[PDB]
Amino acid sequence: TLNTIALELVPPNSDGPDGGREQAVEDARKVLRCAAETGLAGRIGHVMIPGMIEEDPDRPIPMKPKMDVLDFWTIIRPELPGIRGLCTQVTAFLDEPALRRRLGDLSAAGFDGIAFVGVPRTMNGVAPTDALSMFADLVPNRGAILIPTRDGEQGRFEFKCERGATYGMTQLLYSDAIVGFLREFARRTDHRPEILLSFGFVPKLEAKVGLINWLIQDPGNPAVAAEQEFVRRLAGLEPADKRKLMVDLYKRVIDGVADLGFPLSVHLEATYGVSVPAFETFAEMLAYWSP
């Protein structure tokens, strides 16, 4: 059981003369600063470093290269004493021996959990679900991605638990759909993976860029339609009003799943960047319930 507060920390752009090293150091320090200014010093137990970033084909300016998960971790680990590592890992370009070597490298560096994921839309090894069960003593927390609104997620997530998933890291949660999912999942199955509950701060910039709106989109799915409308509302609200709405949602989710039998961790995300306003919302969420 992780039983932790994980912060999403995206590696910096490596296109510059220094490869993003100084940017990585300022990122780690800004995380500690925001936590300190909001009353959450020492509360974060893990950083969640994504090894894959969804690419939107319709973004005009292509995404600059990013640091490797492990290169990024090597720089920020001295800056984040006591905090452990989580990550996502693309497995499509790793055969079983190469997967063994990567798992060993991550395990040695101090990663507790790893979620295997696929490649972006615009991109061309072991399948993520087949990797869950391989070399299970290395990075023993093996994660699957859970999207409770997705069609057929019940049988999909159930099969991933069969195949060795020990925790589920959810897509960003902007409704209480996770409550109905886990209730039905606990009714149908004995599987009780730890659920890493993902909550993402929404700033006013979402109203212009629409990044989060795109990340969660699911055309035709009315449940996601409701969530996108919730995100669009949040983005236009004044800072205090949106903090209350996200905290209320947080309470509905925690209160909805608290008696279902799944171990709970919390996954904090700030899609547009770590900020003090983001951590002001995080703090009030964790003040209601915290792992």
Side-chain angles (χ1 to χ4, degrees), residues 19-207:
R21 294 215 193 155
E22 182 50 45
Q23 186 59 64
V25 170
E26 302 186 359
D27 291 349
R29 293 177 176 164
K30 174 159 188 183
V31 169
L32 293 181
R33 185 163 63 261
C34 292
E37 297 189 17
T38 59
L40 290 167
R43 302 297 298 279
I44 295 176
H46 279 95
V47 291
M48 216 305 301
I49 306 176
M52 182 277 293
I53 306 295
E54 302 291 328
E55 151 160 350
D56 175 1
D58 286 326
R59 301 276 158 206
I61 291 194
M63 271 195 320
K64 293 314 222 128
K66 284 274 175 197
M67 290 195 73
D68 177 72
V69 164
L70 202 42
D71 294 339
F72 179 43
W73 176 247
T74 298
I75 288 154
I76 60 168
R77 192 193 194 187
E79 300 291 325
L80 301 173
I83 295 168
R84 291 229 108 206
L86 302 171
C87 71
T88 58
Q89 177 74 49
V90 172
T91 61
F93 307 87
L94 268 47
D95 70 338
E96 299 183 8
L99 177 64
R100 169 57 187 67
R101 297 195 296 274
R102 182 63 155 174
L103 290 168
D105 285 355
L106 299 167
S107 167
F111 284 87
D112 292 330
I114 177 168
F116 307 112
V117 302
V119 305
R121 299 165 153 211
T122 57
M123 189 177 261
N124 277 349
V126 176
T129 295
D130 286 330
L132 288 171
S133 63
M134 303 198 176
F135 322 104
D137 58 311
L138 304 174
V139 192
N141 298 284
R142 300 302 186 75
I145 304 306
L146 167 60
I147 306 176
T149 57
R150 191 161 49 182
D151 299 326
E153 195 72 359
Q154 286 288 338
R156 181 175 297 97
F157 188 58
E158 193 283 332
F159 180 78
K160 297 177 179 180
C161 290
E162 286 195 33
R163 299 288 292 115
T166 63
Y167 70 91
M169 183 168 74
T170 73
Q171 172 66 286
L172 289 174
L173 307 168
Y174 289 112
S175 65
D176 64 1
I178 186 64
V179 174
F181 177 94
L182 292 172
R183 181 173 285 286
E184 176 63 9
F185 194 80
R187 185 196 70 71
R188 239 183 70 257
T189 85
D190 292 324
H191 306 301
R192 296 296 182 277
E194 181 170 14
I195 304 307
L196 245 179
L197 298 165
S198 304
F199 295 96
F201 175 73
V202 183
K204 288 184 176 160
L205 184 59
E206 170 65 15

Side-chain angles (χ1 to χ4, degrees), residues 57 80 108 132 265-266 274 290:
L80 301 173
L132 288 171
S265 292
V266 168
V274 160
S290 181

